[PDB]
């Protein structure tokens, strides 16, 4: 299947005292591998996966220099955006940035992206062609004119189709023992009487990787959404994910219901029945 490298950046202004809080996180697929936190002691890009610890001092010095440069750009942007939106110095504001690249099933460049938000709303985004911008409002249109004149899309296109996919492929090889391993969901069903007449069936998917999964209930072989509940996929904390789906059924009719589990680690989807 496809693989992704993504970097996430958050800056939050602190009008009471001092400079913005800045947090940067790097992922390959659903695995965090690096972090930077302005509040942490190291003031360095830090490893968060064993397979990145391989990289030598030049790597860590280079990533530390770039992530600190990113933090200064975000600090300046918080000032610029306060200006564009005519906001007071008194309030806290947030900038968010996410960029990265996907390789396809053929291990070649598939797509690139670079998205920016102010106070949790779309600001400016690089379009799929990596040659044009989506500006949400007239502040973002000002940025779009600046970035057109500075050929920012050309700069990002070179990174996204070059360095980004080359280093994604390097990480995927260095970390292959985990990054290129699928963990199929461990599935089971629980049964909970809700009354004398009704039971809840809960279909569990545990310890799976990557996070993408589909749980569906059928009754007599037809999809059922009525009287179902599906929780948001959640992290286990050990790098794997969890999800459950539940349905309320008439007691004694449990055998009519099947839970269908779709995941990259399953050659064929699993069917569970009480």
């Amino acid at each position: 299947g496809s693989h992704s490298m993504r970097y996430f950046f958050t800056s939050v202004s602190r009008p009471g005292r001092g400079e913005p809080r800045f947090i940067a996180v790097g992922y390959v697929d659903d695995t965090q591998f690096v972090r930077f936190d302005s509040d942490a002691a190291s003031q360095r890009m830090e490893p968060r996966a064993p397979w990145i610890e391989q990289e030598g001092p030049e790597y860590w010095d280079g990533e530390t220099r770039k992530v600190k440069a990113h933090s200064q750009t975000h600090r300046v942007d918080l000032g610029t955006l306060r200006g564009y939106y005519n906001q007071s110095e008194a309030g806290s504001h947030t900038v968010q940035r996410m960029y990265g690249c996907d390789v396809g099933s053929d291990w070649r460049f598939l797509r690139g992206y670079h998205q920016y938000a102010y106070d949790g709303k779309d600001y400016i985004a690089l379009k799929e062609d990596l040659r044009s911008w989506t500006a949400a409002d007239m502040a973002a249109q000002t940025t779009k004119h600046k970035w057109e004149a500075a050929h920012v899309a050309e700069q990002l296109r070179a990174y996204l189709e070059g360095t980004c996919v080359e280093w994604l492929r390097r990480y995927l090889e260095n970390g292959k023992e985990t990054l290129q391993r699928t963990d199929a969901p461990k599935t089971h069903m629980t049964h909970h009487a809700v009354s004398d007449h009704e039971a809840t069936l809960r279909c569990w998917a545990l310890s799976f990787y990557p996070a993408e999964i589909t749980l569906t209930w059928q009754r007599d072989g037809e999809d059922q959404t009525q009287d179902t509940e599906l929780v948001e996929t959640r992290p286990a904390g050990d790098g794997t994910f969890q999800k459950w789906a539940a349905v309320v059924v008439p007691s004694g009719q449990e055998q009519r219901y099947t839970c269908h589990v779709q995941h990259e680690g399953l050659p064929k989807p699993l069917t569970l029945r009480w």
């Binding site: 970097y7 790097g26 280079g62 990533e63 770039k66 992530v67 440069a69 990113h70 750009t73 975000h74 300046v76 942007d77 610029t80 955006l81 564009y84 960029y99 920016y116 600001y123 400016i124 940025t143 600046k146 970035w147 500075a150 920012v152 700069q155 990002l156 990174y159 360095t163 980004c164 280093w167």
Partner: peptide
């Protein structure tokens, strides 16, 4: 690997 430059908005 991070991008080398971040141009301001």
């Amino acid at each position: 690997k991070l991008v080398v430059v971040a141009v301001g908005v």
